[PDB]
Amino acid sequence: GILDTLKQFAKGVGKDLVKGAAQGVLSTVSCKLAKTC
């Protein structure tokens, strides 16, 4: 349903964030003075 629909994309504009967190990691996170990575 609609309540699964928004959840699907949310659990994907959340994977992209987990992917964004899972980018460097230490290089990005440490590099993340003002997100210069």
From Swiss-Prot:
Monomer. Belongs to the frog skin active peptide (FSAP) family. Brevinin subfamily. One of its GO terms (cellular component) is extracellular region. Keywords: Amphibian defense peptide, Antibiotic, Antimicrobial, Cleavage on pair of basic residues, Disulfide bond, Secreted, Signal. Has a non-hemolytic activity. Has a broad spectrum of activity against both Gram-positive and Gram-negative bacteria, fungi and protozoa. It is found in: Secreted. This is Gaegurin-4. The chain holds residues 44 to 80 of 80 of the full protein. Disulfide bonds join 31-37. GO terms for biological process: defense response to bacterium. Expressed by the skin glands. It comes from Glandirana rugosa (Japanese wrinkled frog). It comes from the Eukaryota. Its main location: secreted.
